[PDB]
Amino acid sequence: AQNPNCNIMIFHPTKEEFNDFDKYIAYMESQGAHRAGLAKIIPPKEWKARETYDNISEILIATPLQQVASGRAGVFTQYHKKKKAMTVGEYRHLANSKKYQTPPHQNFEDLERKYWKNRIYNSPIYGADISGSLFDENTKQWNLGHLGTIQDLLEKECGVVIEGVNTPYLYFGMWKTTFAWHTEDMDLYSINYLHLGEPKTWYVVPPEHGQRLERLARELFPGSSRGCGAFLRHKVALISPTVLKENGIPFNRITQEAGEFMVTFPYGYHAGFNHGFNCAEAINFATPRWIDYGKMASQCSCGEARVTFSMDAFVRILQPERYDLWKRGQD
Numbered sequence: 001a002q003n004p005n006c007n008i009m010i011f012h013p014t015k016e017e018f019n020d021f022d023k024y025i026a027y028m029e030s031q032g033a034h035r036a037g038l039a040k041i042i043p044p045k046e047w048k049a050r051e052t053y054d055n056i057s058e059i060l061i062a063t064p065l066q067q068v069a070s071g072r073a074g075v076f077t078q079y080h081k082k083k084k085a086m087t088v089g090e091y092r093h094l095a096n097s098k099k100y101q102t103p104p105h106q107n108f109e110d111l112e113r114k115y116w117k118n119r120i121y122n123s124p125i126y127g128a129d130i131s132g133s134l135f136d137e138n139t140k141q142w143n144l145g146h147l148g149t150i151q152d153l154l155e156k157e158c159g160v161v162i163e164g165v166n167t168p169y170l171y172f173g174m175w176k177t178t179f180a181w182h183t184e185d186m187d188l189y190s191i192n193y194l195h196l197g198e199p200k201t202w203y204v205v206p207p208e209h210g211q212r213l214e215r216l217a218r219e220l221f222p223g224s225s226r227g228c229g230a231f232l233r234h235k236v237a238l239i240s241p242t243v244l245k246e247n248g249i250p251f252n253r254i255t256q257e258a259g260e261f262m263v264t265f266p267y268g269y270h271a272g273f274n275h276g277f278n279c280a281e282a283i284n285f286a287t288p289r290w291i292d293y294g295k296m297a298s299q300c301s302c303g304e305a306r307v308t309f310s311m312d313a314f315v316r317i318l319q320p321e322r323y324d325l326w327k328r329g330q331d
């Protein structure tokens with residue numbers, strides 16, 4: 001078995017290897033990359049997502065989210081308070097202000113220490129989940145707005161035509177902006193490109209050990225667990241590496257820099273934080289190997305997780321027994 005310790009693997013495709021996205025994902029899996037839950041892909045040196053980032057300041061962040069924490073430094077939840085709209089140029093200025101800017105630090109490890117020590121005492125503002133793309137239309141390789149759609153994959157594998165669409169999302173971050181422990185909707189893959197700015201640190205649990213993370217989360221967040229049998233779908237809970245290590249949960253960490261892709265694999269729990277002002281683009285995707293994960297994915301039916309239009313068909317076709325109850329949660 002390849003990669004039996006479930007280490008995060010880093011890939012360096014040539015420009016030739018970067019032509020066929022599906023083929024490269026299947027290659028990475030042949031080497032065991034999915035066992036980690038997360039892989040890094042450094043694009044060939046010849047490739048670029050677009051010519052410059054000089055003209056992005058007028059993008060609107062319609063609903064910036066202030067991420068307010070509750071709990072203790074290593075075990076906390078966050079809620080998202082909606083803020084007034086602002087442009088990307090306005091948000092960048094805010095991120096660079098004395099109140100929100102990255103503190104002085106020695107290296108990524110020192111910054112990680114400072115994040116876990118101090119995150120809960122601040123409420124950074126995240127421009128998350130903005131439909132759109134920063135890939136030039138002429139970028140032909142690994143253009144996250146030109147991928148094969150999940151509805152087309154389900155149709156190709158299973159023969160059933162379904163409604164829905166699959167488009168990318170932009171994320172504008174600042175110091176301490178945080179993504180809570182989660183897997184993707186329907187335990188899909190994700191791919192994330194860091195277009196510009198400061199790094200993003202990731203934590204990930206191997207898919208084969210995901211239920212260990214779930215059991216610890218039920219212990220650490222006991223009221224939330226009673227409320228919902230899949231409360232990590234709410235995307236609000238944080239657990240630090242120190243707490244994970246104290247409780248024997250297998251995980252790995254890596255820092256993504258501008259110009260790099262990350263792929264998350266089906267049922268790979270992940271969480272992380274931004275180092276400073278940045279912009280990322282991400283989208284879900286599927287392969288044949290996903291189908292079985294989609295059939296077994298947990299679901300929130302308490303009503304909190306509230307997701308996209310396109311998840312309906314996935315539930316309806318892959319999980320017809322759950323459909324009724326899940327849809328009650330969505331309506």
Ligand SMILES: O=C(O)CNC(=O)C(=O)O
Pocket residue numbers: 171178179190191192264270280282283
């Ligand atoms: O970058 C972020 O805030 C969160 N992104 C992801 O969870 C992802 O790409 O799957």
Ligand SMILES: [Mg+2]
Pocket residue numbers: 055056057058059
């Ligand atoms: Mg603009």
Ligand code: NI
Pocket residue numbers: 182183184190264270
């Ligand atoms: Ni994710």
Ligand SMILES: [Zn+2]
Pocket residue numbers: 227228229230231233234300301302303304305
């Ligand atoms: Zn729920």
